[PDB]
Every structure is written in C-alpha cells, then in structure tokens.
Design an enzyme around this catalytic site. Structure first.
Site, PDB file in Angstrom:
ATOM      1  N   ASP A 197      -0.134  -7.395   2.347  1.00  0.00           N
ATOM      2  CA  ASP A 197      -0.142  -6.290   1.944  1.00  0.00           C
ATOM      3  C   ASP A 197       1.162  -6.220   1.848  1.00  0.00           C
ATOM      4  O   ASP A 197       2.565  -5.688   3.125  1.00  0.00           O
ATOM      5  CB  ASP A 197      -0.439  -5.410   2.532  1.00  0.00           C
ATOM      6  CG  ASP A 197      -0.207  -4.174   2.688  1.00  0.00           C
ATOM      7  OD1 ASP A 197       0.558  -3.364   1.721  1.00  0.00           O
ATOM      8  OD2 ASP A 197      -0.328  -3.039   3.591  1.00  0.00           O
ATOM      9  N   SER A 246       4.108   3.155   7.938  1.00  0.00           N
ATOM     10  CA  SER A 246       3.584   2.145   7.753  1.00  0.00           C
ATOM     11  C   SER A 246       4.683   1.322   6.274  1.00  0.00           C
ATOM     12  O   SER A 246       5.570   2.465   6.092  1.00  0.00           O
ATOM     13  CB  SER A 246       2.531   2.552   6.484  1.00  0.00           C
ATOM     14  OG  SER A 246       1.886   2.501   7.541  1.00  0.00           O
ATOM     15  N   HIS A 296       0.649  -1.322  -0.268  1.00  0.00           N
ATOM     16  CA  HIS A 296      -0.022   0.012   0.568  1.00  0.00           C
ATOM     17  C   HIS A 296       1.108   1.419   0.225  1.00  0.00           C
ATOM     18  O   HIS A 296       0.431   2.370  -0.645  1.00  0.00           O
ATOM     19  CB  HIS A 296      -1.256   0.083   1.058  1.00  0.00           C
ATOM     20  CG  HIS A 296      -0.545   0.411   2.504  1.00  0.00           C
ATOM     21  ND1 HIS A 296       0.136  -0.086   3.710  1.00  0.00           N
ATOM     22  CD2 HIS A 296      -0.374   1.763   3.061  1.00  0.00           C
ATOM     23  CE1 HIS A 296       0.105   0.489   4.564  1.00  0.00           C
ATOM     24  NE2 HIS A 296       0.257   1.674   4.222  1.00  0.00           N
TER      25      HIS A 296
END
Ligand SMILES: CC(=O)N[C@@H]1[C@@H](O)[C@H](O)[C@@H](CO)O[C@H]1O
EC number: 3.4.21.5
Lengths: 248, 28
Positions: free
Chosen positions: A99, A196, A43
């Site tokens: 992911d 992230s 992502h």
C-alpha cells in the site's frame, strides 16, 4: 488522530496533506521526502470498490500546515501534482499489501522552518529501530472534529508480529507491520482514517535524525476496537521508491 | 536528502519537542 496531544510548530515539517480539488476535501496524509517527491498510501489514490481512481489533476497538496482551519500566510504552501505512481503490486482486492504510492510535485517546494524532508531508512536503521515495543510517531488533524484543531501527535509502540496476526482477519504480509497500545491499555492514542497515507516516523538515537519507517495504511473512522493500525514497511519498499525517482 | 530528518526548529536549534523523549526511552 485520536487521543493525541497538540503538535508544536515545526514539529513534523515533512507532513503533507492530500486534498481533492473539487469539491475541496481532505483525503489523506502524506510525507515530503525531497523538494519534489511526496510519499503516501496507494489506497488514498486508488480503491476501486469505492469508485476511487484519482488522476493528477484531481488533486493538490498543502505543505507546512499547522492549523486545519486557519490559513497560515507565508508559511503554508500549495502544490499541484505532475505524476502519480502507484506500486504495480498494490493488492487492493485482499489485504492492501504494498500500500504505497509516490506523487511528483509540478514544481519543487521551497524548504523553510516549516517545510523539510524526512529521511528514508537505510538497512542498519531499519534493523536497529523496527523492533516490537519501540515507539514511532504519527501526526494528523484531530479526527474527532471540533473547532481550533492544530496538528495532533501520537506515539505508538510497534506490536509483536503474532499479536498483530491474531488481531485481524486479513492475511498480513512481511511488507506490513502494526503499531498501537493494547486493549488493556498502555495508552489509547491512535492514527485514524484521514491520517492514512501519513508517515510513521522514528528518531535514531545514533545520529539524531528522523526516519520514515512506515506509511499509515487502512483505517475506518477511529474505530479499530481491539485492533491495531497497519503500516506499510518503507524500508522493504525502498528499492521501488528509488526506482521510480531515478527513472522519473 | 543530505539534511533530511533534522528539523529547523528542533535539532538544528538544539531544542527537543515535548514527547520525543518517549520515543528514545522506548528504544531498549
Ligand atoms: C488507465 C486507468 O486509468 N486504469 C484504471 C485502473 O488503474 C483501475 O484499477 C481501474 C479500476 O477503477 O480503473 C482504471
């Protein structure tokens, strides 16, 4: 990172920071797994609802950094990307299952006191360490803003699977786990947006080595409120990592 | 790969970081 403490110099030498070239902006964390291969979240690279679909030439990484705002002469290194590989079953539409992405550096990075790869888990290390209550570590810059800002560290317990499941609307899969302290408060540190893509690492007491057990998945700002961060289960995806590296 | 996960400024120097004990103590 929020409610962390200052990392020490050389404490997370596998930490990689992923930047957009133009305009220059920090996008995500990532991790050094060899002199040429970097692991991150899919992502961070591909998220169509936000018109995000980076090519290799859009991006750069900085490695060996401690300070967000100070250039660290002869220590920090910059690399361009030769190729991006996103998991073909990365599910961006629904729950961000799988992911995960790999990035190949254009040239190898030189290892140093500040730059050093993290281990990928083997089966016995994953079986031993991936247990509710056991703590792992996330590193990133103070996603609280400020001035000096050196790398921050938070250590977070793995959460029981049913508790994870109840904390979210999303359909969680076996390829994810969640970590963090309860609302009623063990502590209050957490990984943020910006963290992230970065690694969730655990130290094996058996052999004294650091293993990357998780990849920090989706977060917005630092508000999860009542929620827990989700992490891509690196061991379960290890054959994919090896497939990509062995072929390319 | 051979040397993965052993930090030059910590494990390789027999030095511990400030909070790694918190991780190891949780592994019960
Ligand atoms: C060849 C190529 O670039 N394909 C991409 C695809 O991966 C992505 O899902 C889509 C949505 O933005 O944009 C296009």
């Amino acid at each position: 990172i929020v409610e962390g403490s200052d990392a020490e110099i050389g404490m997370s030498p596998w930490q990689v920071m992923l930047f957009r070239k133009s305009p220059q902006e920090l996008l995500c964390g990532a991790s050094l797994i060899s002199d040429r291969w970097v692991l991150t979240a899919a992502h961070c690279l591909l998220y169509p609802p936000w018109d995000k679909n980076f090519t290799e030439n859009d991006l750069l990484v900085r490695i060996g950094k401690h300070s967000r705002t100070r250039y660290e002469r002869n220590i920090e290194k910059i690399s361009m990307l030769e190729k991006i590989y996103i998991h073909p079953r990365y599910n961006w539409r629904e729950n961000l299952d799988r992911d995960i992405a790999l990035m190949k550096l254009k040239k190898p990075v030189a290892f140093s006191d500040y730059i050093h790869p993290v281990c990928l888990p083997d089966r016995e290390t994953a079986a031993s360490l991936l247990q509710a209550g056991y703590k792992g570590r996330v590193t990133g810059w103070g996603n609280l803003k400020g001035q000096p800002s050196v790398l921050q560290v938070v250590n977070l317990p793995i959460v029981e699977r049913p508790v994870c499941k109840d904390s979210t609307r999303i359909r969680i899969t076996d390829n994810m786990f969640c970590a963090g302290y309860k609302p009623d408060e063990g502590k209050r540190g957490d990984a943020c947006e910006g963290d992230s893509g970065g690694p969730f690492v655990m130290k094996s007491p058996f052999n004294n080595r650091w293993y990357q057990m998780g990849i920090v998945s989706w977060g917005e700002g630092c508000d999860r409120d009542g929620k827990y961060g989700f992490y891509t289960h690196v061991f379960r995806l290890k054959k994919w990592i090896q497939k990509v590296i062995d072929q390319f | 790969e051979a040397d993965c996960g052993l930090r030059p400024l910590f494990e390789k120097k027999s030095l511990e970081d400030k909070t790694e004990r918190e991780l190891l103590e949780s592994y019960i």
